[PDB]
Amino acid sequence: GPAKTMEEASKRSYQFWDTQPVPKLGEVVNTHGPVEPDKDNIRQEPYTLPQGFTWDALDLGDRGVLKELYTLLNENYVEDDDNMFRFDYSPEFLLWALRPPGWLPQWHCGVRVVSSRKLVGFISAIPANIHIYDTEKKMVEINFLCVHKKLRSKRVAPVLIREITRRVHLEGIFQAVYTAGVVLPKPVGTCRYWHRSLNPRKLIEVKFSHLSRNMTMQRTMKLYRLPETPKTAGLRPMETKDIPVVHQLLTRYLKQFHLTPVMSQEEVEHWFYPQENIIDTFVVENANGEVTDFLSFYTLPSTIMNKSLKAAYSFYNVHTQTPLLDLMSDALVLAKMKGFDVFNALDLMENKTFLEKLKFGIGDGNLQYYLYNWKCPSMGAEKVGLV
Amino acid sequence: GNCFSKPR
Ligand SMILES: CCCCCCCCCCCCCC(=O)SCCNC(=O)CCNC(=O)[C@H](O)C(C)(C)COP(=O)(O)OP(=O)(O)OC[C@H]1O[C@@H](n2cnc3c(N)ncnc32)[C@H](O)[C@@H]1OP(=O)(O)O
């Protein structure tokens, strides 16, 4: 079964990952480069699925197929430690995460039951240029690995990982980045999720959170209380004319970390140009008409296995003139103004400078960052600049 | 792929 701590993991044997070009769990890494020479010929045939299951590439432009994808994900995707909450991926959100610039339909890899055509499996790859230490390499970001609950523990996830690798090798890419809540060989960096309450009562009824030892409900609300309006001057939603400068600010600010994306202006528009109930981005235009900072957070509500828990996830926040503490404080205010219930943020990047000061509490979940077929020293959360 | 964390 899954393992959530490395202590838990170092006892486990990895029947699949020991066969993969990833550093072993105990191995200390001080080299820089791939684990495997690029393959000159790639298997033309799809891998063999267990009897009664077939490959199918999902055309998310077909609204019916996209409906099949979110229904699969909304019923069988990531859950919390206690099986109380499950992500509620909207169709318009998945198009955002699954059709960025450069997407390929054969990278929307799904598994269907042969007889019924019922979608029972999925995995995805989107292209991304990744800066890791001192190498800028083109990789894919693997996301949305999902085997239906009725098919679990039958070694169908390894087949999905192999088949998506094959389809990415065919396009000439040989590295990949991905995250996870479980420990596998081998985390290049471990990031903790932190949680800032915005509506304490909602998260206490639903049992997302709990009242601290000697603290009433009344005090808890007066504690997380926030201003009605933000305080940074010139804060406003990002517009079309801000795509160049948001690219500029993000391109530069990101260079101080060791694992970061490398975005074209077309990609910066896609990932940051606001879409309601998907992505939000606010820029800080100063008294001279210049844009100096921006904050961003994306929307991902969670079904409650017992309405929905509206969560805001901190995305990329770039500061040059506004103090990051004030920037992130206004982010909390804007999230509250928009009806969110909680503001989730990792401890990666400079987030540790404000997580305690802005009343974040620590979460019971770590997000391990992995690289496929790339052997490099691991880093701390503050060096991981990839959300 | 994400993970669902929540306050310790
Ligand atoms: C060149 C480009 C290459 C691109 C490829 C890059 C690699 C991408 C790598 C994947 C990027 C994922 C990115 C995301 O989206 S991480 C999100 C993962 N999704 C979920 O947790 C959703 C809920 N769970 C499920 O859908 C299933 O339980 C999954 C699919 C997780 C496996 O449920 P099942 O019980 O049916 O599994 P199995 O018995 O068939 O097979 C188990 C084998 O697979 C190992 N396993 C278990 N969990 C994960 C995991 N979360 N990531 C990678 N491997 C995992 C497991 O330890 C064992 O290996 P080993 O222990 O024997 O070694």
Author numbering:
A (entry chain A): 104 to 409, 414 to 494
B (entry chain C): 2 to 9
Question: Any passages from the paper?
Answer:
Glycylpeptide N-tetradecanoyltransferase 1, commonly known as N-myristoyltransferases (NMTs, EC 2.3.1.97), are universally conserved eukaryotic enzymes responsible for a major post-translational modification (PTM), myristoylation (MYR). Here we report a series of high-resolution HsNMT1 structures co-crystallised with MyrCoA and reactive substrate peptides. These structures reveal snapshots across the entire catalytic mechanism including the reactive intermediate state, thereby providing the high-resolution map of MYR reaction chemistry.
Interestingly, the structure of the complex prior to nucleophilic attack shows that Gly2 interacts with the new catalytic base Glu244 via two water molecules of the water channel (left), confirming their importance for NMT catalysis. Accordingly, using an in vitro MYR assay, we established that the truncation does not alter the protein turnover rate (kcat) and observed a significant reduction in the enzyme’s relative affinity to the peptide. This suggests that the C-terminus of the enzyme is also directly involved in correct peptide adjustment into the catalytic centre. The water network shaping the water channel of the NMT:MyrCoA:X complex is unmodified in the various crystal structures described later. Such ordered water molecules ideally bridge the reactive amino terminus next to a catalytic base, usually the carboxy terminal but also alternative carboxylic side chains such as in HsNMT1ΔC2.
